[PDB]
């Protein structure tokens, strides 16, 4: 029959559970009080057996652990199914299927409790665990129900608390190892278990009204409704459609808010954060056939990446599809991700470390065309950055020696360390741009011919042609900055009787300027180094067919000098006669870094120079710094040193600053302060001190070049100019006049160096005098320039042509002073004396009809054939030896 | 005579009839000399407390078909001599406890044709002199146990037309019918209402064996078994695990130390 429930007896099950728990507690406490008041161990053996069984230390242990997990889930499902049935009912054990499964499950749980008790260390504290408590209040009631053939859905919700011991189960099985996963499983298990247990208690209390009201408060809430109610409650929402009405239910709500709202607000955000841990820029790069890809690593940042991308992918170069793959450890920020979005089909980013061979194999450096390692120029410690860069290159070499590398080195000696790497196969291809070396070579070149460093730097940056309506100096300057350095294979028409004589004067036909080996002004299959404005019209050559010297003689050498034999003082410096010389102001301190002045003095002492024509060099500044750099600056001739400081007017008066050919302001302590505002303050003060001097005439027209670490300071060098932070350095008046220089203009070198590897070494033979396979080997092994007795072949290695500045007022070229045809001028320069002019060094106010007292001159690179000239003008040339 | 209501009809011997007079409430001026009162077919919807005051010697009260839906607890105070009540054919949905307690001389209490969903033990109170009851045409789903336990002299009862849900809640009910055999004509009309496996089943056909599953009262054997089942089972499981572990350990030890060389 049905309607089997008349008189209640929940006290049966409840009292059975309570007497079990309390009897265990009291017997354990009685044993403790009795103990207080008074082979190898078989008890320890069985305890160890149980301990091994509970843990997943044997196959039996793992089977039992998995069974515990599965049967805990099964008992929870049994409770969920039984929740629909009334609170009290009568059911037959041997005619029902759910009761038998429940009986088997709780018999297993009883056996597991026995094993846990045997393995337990402290019995009393094991009795009070949540697992033991839920065992005491779940198995006995089922046994009593089987005995009575009567089921009461009482504390069965406590089965949900069996869900807590799931992290421990997984950690035993070695599945759960890492901290994040363990914490996530802990949080999830605690949250779900507490939620379900609270829902079950509310279900029991609301369905079985409070006893003191004679059970007249039945609300009849389904278990799902109680789950929903608890979710709305501990979420702080509180809809109010469903709520507890009984006194016991409201009391549980009051005491559960305090401990459960905090649990929700502390667990949900943490769970979301933990699940949210993912690697966005993972995965590998697919190597598409027929399209080469290069890899870029090192110092990857928004400004560096933007500059490299805008110079690399410029429309001026030919229609070539080279795909860039960036590899950085730090995940990009929003601006960098947007920049990558704007180049969606041209670049990719993959997060990883260049040290790990896994990440190297991920970007497929095995099939890469080249690897480019950018450097952090603006670091507080150059040695650390060079060391990190050499680690990066050595890791790439370790993975793949055959790859070709372009890298930036902040110091010259670390370049020599790079030569020590076994797979530095510079023959087939390899590059190493030393920023200090190339910067100082450019400075020395500008010392020989002012403003040459500006055009050298502008030849390498990719610039599209721009036009301005107003007639200004910028208008003519921008017609020169648009010319880049390209390489083209020669035609079959010029490969006949002789390359040289056909090379000259034919630039009218090709409308381009030409500059098996490196060739510069070839007089007396080859790659022509053109200065065309674009790569579209460079395809017009081949397509159209109508003890004094050094060990090599490349430089000058003299006997070593002691620092005391060259140290001077204001009296003897003023006594000494110096005109048209070079003065180098040096800023430094005790703990300042090492600049390296050898790459500044070497370019000025090539063999094309005569000892009489050799320019004197005097370094003015602190004597400690020059002492530190002296070990390399002592095998050098005709160099003087004045202690003191460039900020003292008298010290500068002694060294004859007014008549020097070039004053070079340099700083070394610029790597100490990282303050943008404070950088180059000594250099700005020194430059302005030079400008404001007076000589029995104002020194504002003294040729001076300042090397600035910070580009933004370029506005303080000159005062009669327009200062805008928006404009770029190449557009600034001091840079266009060759009086300012920064390493930031050399970063384009990589983009050039990759696209034609010759250009870099051409730089090394167009600045710094010359670099041969031998001299690099000698520097690598000795690191000291040495010389010997001259030989005829040594002296014959002097045919080179070095840059020179030619006036225009007096000379056979006076007829062309205002001829209005610059092309006629250089065509004459070529036929009459085999001389090629890069371009024009022109007064800033020359384009204006009204005269002025200005002296600043800017640079024009390759003026058109129909270019008007002014008699007040300067010409860059490549003079030959004699 | 002053003992007769002005609107009602009285005859010698204390018999008064007030029916078919459209009385909206109890007529005033009740006297002690009236023994039987009629009030049927009126419109007395609400019964004021102490309405029948004054006629303490009344013996029979009729209120059938009077639109009764709410009766106060003290409306029948002082009616100790009242014996016959006819409250049937009304809309009484609930009876307040203690309402009929003063009625020590009650013999027939008619609640037929009412909407009484449940009658509670406290509603009838102490009724020792009660001889018979009529609960037909009511919504009494089940009689709470102990209601008949304060009616020692109850020998006649009518239960037709009720939503009798045949389960363990009416076990005290049928126990009466076994010792008070309902006559066959009326017995055939009392049937279970729940549409389960017990429809068209007369209440006298259900024996004890059919409801052996029903909660029997707490004994002294089971009282002790239910307390002892838990701890005894836990101790048995613990001992079984201990014996299994000790035996396995001893067997593995004797296999390992006796075959160390082999
Ligand atoms: Ca261009
Ligand atoms: Ca300015
Ligand atoms: Mg792609």
Curated annotation (Swiss-Prot), chain B:
Set out the biological process GO terms recorded for this chain's protein: positive regulation of voltage-gated potassium channel activity; potassium ion transmembrane transport
Top-rank taxon, per record = Eukaryota
The entry's note on the tissues where this protein occurs is:
Isoform 1 is expressed highly in normal prostate and salivary gland, very weakly in colon, pancreas, and intestine, and not at all in other tissues. Isoform 1 is expressed highly in many cancer cell lines and in breast cancer, pancreatic cancer and colon cancer. Isoform 2 is expressed in cancer cell lines.
**Subcellular location, principal:** membrane
Identify the residues that the record assigns to the LRRCT domain, covering every copy. 162-216
Q: Which UniProt keywords apply?
A: Cell membrane, Cytoplasm, Cytoskeleton, Disulfide bond, Glycoprotein, Ion channel, Ion transport, Leucine-rich repeat, Membrane, Repeat, Signal, Transmembrane, Transmembrane helix, Transport
Kindly indicate whether the keyword Transport belongs to this entry. yes
**Glycosylated position list:** 108
Q: How does it sit in the membrane?
A: Single-pass type I membrane protein
Q: Where is the LRRNT domain?
A: 1-32
Q: Which GO terms describe its molecular function?
A: potassium channel activator activity; potassium channel regulator activity; transmembrane transporter binding; voltage-gated potassium channel activity
The cellular component terms of Gene Ontology attached to this UniProt record, alphabetical and capped at eight, are: cytoplasm; cytoskeleton; extracellular exosome; plasma membrane; voltage-gated potassium channel complex
- Transmembrane stretches, by residue range? 223-243
Statement: the UniProt record of this protein carries the keyword Transmembrane: yes
Q: Cellular location of this protein? A: Cell membrane; Cytoplasm, Cytoskeleton
Give residue ranges on the Extracellular side: 1-222
Disulphide connectivity of cysteines: 4-10, 8-18, 166-192, 168-214
The function of this protein is:
Auxiliary protein of the large-conductance, voltage and calcium-activated potassium channel (BK alpha). Required for the conversion of BK alpha channels from a high-voltage to a low-voltage activated channel type in non-excitable cells. These are characterized by negative membrane voltages and constant low levels of calcium.
Q: Subunit arrangement? A: Interacts with KCNMA1.
Identify this protein by name.
Leucine-rich repeat-containing protein 26
Which organism is this protein's natural source?
Homo sapiens
**Gene that produces this protein:** LRRC26
